[PDB]
Ligand binder design. Structure first.
Ligand SMILES: [Cl-]
Ligand SMILES: [Cl-]
Lengths: 109, 111, 109, 109, 111, 109
């Protein structure tokens, strides 16, 4: 039989990369910051909503925001990126009842 | 052994997944989204994706908003204007899709 | 484990008769102040033109809305004409093209 | 468990509309021709391949060709559109092993 | 009763579905596809869609072809050039995706 | 009948060690004439940067290829370094982020 589909509302991951470094940062065209934070979101348009939440949560900036894939990549100090990721995931839960993920981190060194 | 392949038919459901008002997006976010800075940006996700065209027309007729972009393949509709205008456009677009085309609807949400 | 090869289904998802919409509702929908309005949705969306042709060939109706890709068709005319157009279009899509079909629905105020 | 997916190669329909008429033709932005032929194809890029096969099969022209949906809409005389549809479906089968459909028609009147 | 909703995880397979040479497309078709008239147009479909970027780079390095368009969301790659160049680019792109990235491959086909 | 709400899975689909590629193969791939090349593919594609960081943090490797969206990562360095980077990256994606994992594969000529 025909299967009917719609997008789910999900944060697939929300990951803090501490001190990614020059090589990695250049490859993805983001500043060589203290941290880069990456979120994968469904539907893809969520990246626009998440970008707003991140910017208002902490002193971070947007590396890139892609409505197609749903990727949101932010950068700034390690503490600011951690706070922005945490508040963005929690806000998507509170405002829009997203299925959430745990905040994960890759430490410096 | 290679995985078995099976042909599967799929149809999109008729659903508005997001209808969200971003109040006071700021310059950085507006530039990254790729629309002019405005009082508000409205974000909709439509399934089937092609409903974005009808949704854009409903939005324009409801209030003094502008189309940022409309993507019939991904199902995105992004509008901008005043907070009040964007709110009204989102509300009336969702209502219209429900009333006239029997869409499953989401709540109108706001940041 | 299997690999699913995705292909589109053919489905009529709405086939609705609005008997005597009246001046205000006709204006809202964007059609003349007709005896009836008929609203159909189907997928694939580009096949709305197929439904449009079947409706026109079936009865003395006119097209209020049809485009290339939306999968929505709005027709208008007398109640009998719109009823016949909807009935023959749904039946035709099922018989000729093996669409999965919804029930006809109607509103009268 | 995670479901893995890829596109299938399918002609979902291949439909000849004889004498669609001014109203329908204007709505879809195609000339008011003797016939309009519509094919739905997966993957969507197939519409580009099908367009070539149709144009070389008969004296038809392309109304529109959409790589996103996979729609191919052609126009011309009833006989030319019938031949182009028939040869396009058969060619996709021979050249690319597409899953095919039956050719369908909506008659004049 | 409303239909039950179930969240389902999906992943794209790694597959080249089409790698097709359109010889002598003609002016009408080239215009509708939206590329210059050339001796040939090459059409590829990639899954995951994002592989279109790597595929375009493989194509350019293999032969004197040009990118018509490359769509990382739909998985489309459309190239153009001489029949010989397009044939070589399609062949080497498919081969490279298989050899280096373990893609499931289609046959190189031609009209 | 059910409505499926689609969300992306997390999967590592290739994790391959090429020991002593040699001058010609290194040039073909586009990296220095290193002791080893490591090739990974994963989805969602934008998460290649996560793998890149884990690889760099794990061992003395360099990134030959990484971009924003492709889901492909190429690293290079000594055989031991590339082996360690691949092993720790695959393990890390599984443990930290609950990716579904493939087996490590290797080629030596
Ligand atoms: Cl910083
Ligand atoms: Cl004609």
């Amino acid at each position: 039989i025909i299967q009917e589909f719609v997008p789910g509302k999900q944060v697939t991951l929300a990951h803090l990369i501490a001190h990614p470094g020059e090589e990695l940062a250049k490859k993805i065209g983001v500043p060589d910051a203290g941290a880069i934070g990456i979120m994968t979101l469904t539907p893809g348009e969520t990246a626009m909503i998440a970008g707003d939440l991140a910017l208002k949560a902490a002193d971070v900036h947007i590396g890139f925001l892609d409505r197609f894939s749903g990727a949101l990549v932010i950068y700034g100090s390690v503490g600011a990126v951690e706070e922005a990721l945490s508040q963005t995931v929690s806000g998507l839960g509170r405002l829009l009842n997203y299925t959430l993920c745990e905040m994960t981190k890759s430490l410096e060194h």
